[PDB]
Amino acid sequence: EVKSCKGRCFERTFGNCRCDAACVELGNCCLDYQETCIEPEHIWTCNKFRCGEKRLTRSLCACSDDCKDKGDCCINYSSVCQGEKSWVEEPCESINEPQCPAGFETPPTLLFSLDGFRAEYLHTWGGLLPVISKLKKCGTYTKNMRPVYPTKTFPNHYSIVTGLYPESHGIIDNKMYDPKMNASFSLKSKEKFNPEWYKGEPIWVTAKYQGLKSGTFFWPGSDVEINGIFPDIYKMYNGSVPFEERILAVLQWLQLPKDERPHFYTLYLEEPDSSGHSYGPVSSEVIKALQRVDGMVGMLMDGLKELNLHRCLNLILISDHGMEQGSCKKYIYLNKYLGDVKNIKVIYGPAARLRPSDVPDKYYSFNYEGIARNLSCREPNQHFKPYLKHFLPKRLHFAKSDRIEPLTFYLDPQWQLALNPSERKYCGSGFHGSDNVFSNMQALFVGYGPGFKHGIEADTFENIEVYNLMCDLLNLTPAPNNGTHGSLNHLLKNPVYTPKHPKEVHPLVQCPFTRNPRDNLGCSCNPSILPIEDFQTQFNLTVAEEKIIKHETLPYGRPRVLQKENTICLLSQHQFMSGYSQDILMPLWTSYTVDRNDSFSTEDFSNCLYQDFRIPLSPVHKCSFYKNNTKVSYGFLSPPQLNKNSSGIYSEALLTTNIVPMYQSFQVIWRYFHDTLLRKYAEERNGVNVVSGPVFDFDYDGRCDSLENLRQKRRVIRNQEILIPTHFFIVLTSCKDTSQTPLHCENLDTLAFILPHRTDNSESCVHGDSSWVEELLMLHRARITDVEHITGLSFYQQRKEPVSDILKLKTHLPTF
């Protein structure tokens, strides 16, 4: 009492220890002077020094006995000064019925972003992060949320609230140039506030049109007039506002009367991204930053508990991207290869892009291909790869927008690129922006509230799926977006949207056998191959025989075509089924099944085709059209090397209906896949269902071109109009359980590819062993959903599983 400042801050005294500002110089302050009298001006917490304090006028919050009555207690008052449990101290309790005030018949959703919180931080430092660890334990968690490319702040935040890829929402980076606008985007510029930049519909706009209000305390686009709308409450970005004030403001919004109180909220903190850059992802500063944000989340949860909203609000704790350690030894300078040239502007970092400096004049006319070829395969194990945006892997969906420079660079993990050492920051800092499948780029996601399941660890999903999920939690109709609505139904207690397989628009045409003359196709067939001598006999199949074929080749149902004006017909064979397009003189898809103990022949089958009498014969279906053709060759969808009955060559696979145009350079990849890889996959998985086909994406928009658009994209080769695929897709399907074969799976294990169809193999740097083919396949892996979008096909429509469980499977991207 006599030795303490409690009750007497700033009052003068004769009785020994002092409690006025002069005491410090004299070193005769009471031991508790700072804690009792000064600290309260600078902190938002109660402590054992402050419990029952005489109210101070300058204190940020109160711990005085009268604080509950005046309603300005520090958030931790009850826990510290009345011995009640904090939110984190309480054991998990399930939230089956929400406990909400009137106005929250639909509960609120809060989107809470920790910038640059890599998923790995929680994997390794969970023991140092009790609040986030408890949200994981009590809630719905994934070890990894996959961000969008490039893995940067504005693209990923705007992707989260729109469900769009950056190529569609238009925010592709923190610095952009738009040629059509002839303007540059910068966060320091006034162009940041120009609505022209922000495409799509953020969830706060979706919400407003359907009568819910929004409160954003910082989010990319929330301080911009998008479709003529701001959030009902928004803050002009000011990184200097302390984290505690942002959280206290959101807690004020949740106490507004129901007429003006938002349903959708955002909260954004700059940590741990800021510390990640400045000190690296493995550092004392990042540990301290992680503990600080853990405490801020705890402050929100304690605040919600005080308001009795902790079993009402749906919390989505999220991050935009991860963080990697940069190195000056892992930075590439283009001036080494190009010299100190002054005609190009190079966007530096791991997501490096190149543009002419003379814009908008030379933006399209500039010789990108020149520099592409100049920078290809210059060193062995080169750590960067030049790509024309349309040749990047389709899984990145990084090409449609004109704001994406025609020449991009793909960089290996930990590697960055600039023009020269002058035009970058510090090379040794932490960075992000790399490929969105790299481990250290993976993001945080925890869902907690009445809408979310409890104690669930979901498989990896993409942040573009979150918009639909938030719409479901708010009973909103989602705007068109790149999420698959229902793919995240497994995260929710009570899904509101039941998805249905899409309807096939035109019913399948039939391609009947027509008697016609055995023609010369100009083939020099290998003697070994037993030809088809009675076609009418060999392809007149009994209902019984067909049921056996269908069961073996379409165990999941036939791919369905969703294209508007398209006429496909089913072609049956003993080892494979196919959907043939008369309009493009080519199959859209084949389906077959390689069994564990099947044989692959090394026997030559070049310059051999057999006529299919089910379709009219065409010049492009003849060996003669391809004989010494320098511009294009051909390849088979269903592989002739695969024989079940004989050990020779499966003759039916040599039909004119099972060939697609194919560059000689691509034949190496295709030959290696069917000869070597497909055999290894069949063995390892105890059988593999295969569906392969061509892909036409001339608009490089990740979508199948219309038949109308395809009629203008045909090339003329030897005075014939031929359509040459942009890509080839493959979809492998085995069982999770290798005890079962692909016709009797309880759970499907899938692996899909969208292989670019290029005239050379410059991408793979072929010099030193066809091991490079596997690397190319992995880099160009895709979600089945990516294949569906780009082919206009829809798979697995006859699996017994509920539709949402299939959508989960189709949106999966594999890791290795």
Ligand X SMILES: *[C@@H]1O[C@H](CO)[C@@H](O[C@@H]2O[C@H](CO)[C@@H](O[C@H]3O[C@H](CO)[C@@H](O)[C@H](O)[C@@H]3O)[C@H](O)[C@H]2NC(C)=O)[C@H](O)[C@H]1NC(C)=O
Ligand Y SMILES: *[C@@H]1O[C@H](CO)[C@@H](O[C@@H]2O[C@H](CO)[C@@H](O)[C@H](O)[C@H]2NC(C)=O)[C@H](O)[C@H]1NC(C)=O
Binding site for ligand NAG (CB under 6 A): 182, 338-339, 341, 360, 374, 607, 628
Q: Is 502 a residue that touches ligand X (CB under 6 A)? A: no
CB < 8 Å & 24+ apart, contacts of 735-743: 735/685, 735/686, 738/684, 738/685, 738/686, 739/686, 740/686, 741/595, 741/596, 741/686, 741/687, 742/555, 742/593, 742/685, 742/687, 742/688, 742/689, 743/551, 743/552, 743/555, 743/593, 743/687
Per CB under 6 A, residues contacting ligand SRA are: 116, 152-153, 174, 187, 218-220, 237, 239, 268, 270, 273
Residue 244 tokens, joined:
């505690």
Site for ligand X in 673-732 (CB under 6 A): 701-703
Q: CB-based burial of residue 211 (10 Å sphere; 0-12 exposed, 13-18 middle, 19+ buried)?
A: exposed
- Residue (238 or 628) nearer to ligand Y, CB: 238
Question: Annotation-wise, does 174 bind a ligand?
Answer: yes
Closest separation in Å from C-beta 410 to ligand SRA:
19
CA distances, 17 to each of 5, 50, 476, 687 (Å): 8, 18, 63, 84
> DSSP letter string over 518-555?
---------TTS---S-HHHHT---HHHHHHHHHHH-T
Q: Is 195 a residue that touches ligand X (CB under 6 A)? A: no
Question: Annotation-wise, does 757 bind a ligand?
Answer: no
Site for ligand X in 776-795 (CB under 6 A): 789
Question: Annotation-wise, does 701 bind a ligand?
Answer: yes
Q: Which of 734, 640, 743 is nearest to 680 (CA)?
A: 734
Residue from 32, 35, 53, 115 in contact with Zn ion (CB under 5 A): 115
Closest separation in Å from C-beta 426 to ligand SRA:
13
- Residue (597 or 628) nearer to ligand NAG, CB: 628
Secondary structure of residue 209 in the 3-state scheme: helix
Per CB under 6 A, residues contacting ligand Y are: 238, 240-241
Stretch that binds Zn ion, among 87-95, 111-119, 186-194, 768-776 (CB under 5 A): 111-119
> Phi, psi at residue 750, to the nearest 5°?
-110, 155
Closest separation in Å from C-beta 247 to Zn ion:
19
| Alpha-carbon dihedral sign for residues 507, 513, 517, 523 | positive
Give the number of residues written for the chain. 816
- Residue (187 or 328) nearer to ligand SRA, CB: 187
Closest separation in Å from C-beta 118 to ligand Y:
28
Closest separation in Å from C-beta 175 to ligand Y:
23
Q: Which of 585, 809, 702, 724 is nearest to 149 (CA)?
A: 702
CA distances, 660 to each of 580, 636, 639, 723, 773 (Å): 11, 6, 12, 9, 20
Q: Is 397 a residue that touches ligand X (CB under 6 A)? A: yes
Residue 28 tokens, joined:
């005769």
Question: Annotation-wise, does 237 bind a ligand?
Answer: yes
Residue from 45, 78, 142, 168 in contact with ligand X (CB under 6 A): 168
- Residue (302 or 788) nearer to ligand X, CB: 788
Q: Is 635 a residue that touches ligand X (CB under 6 A)? A: no
User: Of ligand SRA, ligand Y, ligand NAG, none, which one sits near residue 341, judging by CB under 5 to 8 A according to partner kind?
Assistant: ligand NAG
Q: Is 173 a residue that touches Zn ion (CB under 5 A)? A: no
Question: Annotation-wise, does 697 bind a ligand?
Answer: yes
Q: Is 153 a residue that touches Zn ion (CB under 5 A)? A: yes
Q: Is 152 a residue that touches ligand X (CB under 6 A)? A: no
User: Of ligand X, ligand Y, Zn ion, none, which one sits near residue 53, judging by CB under 5 to 8 A according to partner kind?
Assistant: none
Closest separation in Å from C-beta 328 to ligand NAG:
24
620 neighbors 712 (Cβ within 8 angstroms): no
Q: Is 482 a residue that touches ligand X (CB under 6 A)? A: yes
- Residue (387 or 415) nearer to ligand X, CB: 387
| Distance between first and last Cα of the chain | 66
What is the signed CA dihedral for 607, 608, 614, 616, rounded to 10 degrees?
30
Question: Annotation-wise, does 12 bind a ligand?
Answer: no
- Residue (116 or 393) nearer to ligand SRA, CB: 116
Q: ∠ CA 540-546-552 to the nearest 5 degrees?
A: 135
114 neighbors 271 (Cβ within 8 angstroms): yes
Question: Annotation-wise, does 732 bind a ligand?
Answer: no
Count Cβ atoms below 10 Å from residue 115 Cβ, excluding itself: 22
> Phi, psi at residue 474, to the nearest 5°?
-105, 10
Question: Annotation-wise, does 705 bind a ligand?
Answer: yes
User: Of ligand SRA, ligand Y, ligand NAG, none, which one sits near residue 220, judging by CB under 5 to 8 A according to partner kind?
Assistant: ligand SRA
Closest separation in Å from C-beta 557 to ligand X:
23
Question: Annotation-wise, does 604 bind a ligand?
Answer: no
Question: Annotation-wise, does 192 bind a ligand?
Answer: yes
Report how far residue 203's alpha carbon sits from residue 266's, in angstroms, rounded to the nearest whole number. Answer: 11
Closest separation in Å from C-beta 19 to ligand Y:
25
CB-based contacts of 773, cutoff 8 Å, min separation 6: 668, 669, 672, 673, 677, 764
Question: Annotation-wise, does 454 bind a ligand?
Answer: no
- Residue (22 or 241) nearer to ligand SRA, CB: 241
- Residue (199 or 493) nearer to ligand X, CB: 199
User: Of ligand Y, ligand NAG, Zn ion, none, which one sits near residue 240, judging by CB under 5 to 8 A according to partner kind?
Assistant: ligand Y
Closest separation in Å from C-beta 373 to ligand NAG:
8
Q: Which of 410, 406, 412 is nearest to 368 (CA)?
A: 406
User: Of ligand X, ligand NAG, Zn ion, none, which one sits near residue 397, judging by CB under 5 to 8 A according to partner kind?
Assistant: ligand X
696 neighbors 708 (Cβ within 8 angstroms): no
158 neighbors 220 (Cβ within 8 angstroms): yes
Closest separation in Å from C-beta 244 to ligand Y:
10
Report how far residue 619's alpha carbon sits from residue 606's, in angstroms, rounded to the nearest whole number. Answer: 18
Q: Residues of 527-566 as b/e, b for ≥16 C-beta within 10 angstroms?
A: eebeebeebeeebeeeeeeeeebbebbbbbebbbbbbeeb
Question: Annotation-wise, does 429 bind a ligand?
Answer: yes
CA distances, 142 to each of 151, 273, 433, 462, 750 (Å): 18, 20, 21, 10, 20
348 neighbors 458 (Cβ within 8 angstroms): no
User: Of Zn ion, ligand SRA, ligand NAG, none, which one sits near residue 182, judging by CB under 5 to 8 A according to partner kind?
Assistant: ligand NAG
Query: Which residue matches tokens 């060939």?
Result: 659
User: Of ligand SRA, ligand NAG, ligand X, none, which one sits near residue 263, judging by CB under 5 to 8 A according to partner kind?
Assistant: none
Displacement of CA 10 from its chain's centroid (Å): 58
Q: Is 199 a residue that touches ligand X (CB under 6 A)? A: yes
Q: Is 167 a residue that touches Zn ion (CB under 5 A)? A: no
Question: Annotation-wise, does 72 bind a ligand?
Answer: no
Q: Catalytic amino acids?
A: 153
Residues interacting with ligand X, by CB under 6 A? Answer: 164, 168, 199-200, 397, 480-482, 701-703, 789
Numbered residues of the known binding site = 115, 153, 174, 187, 192, 237, 273, 277, 320-321, 429, 432, 697, 699, 701, 703, 705
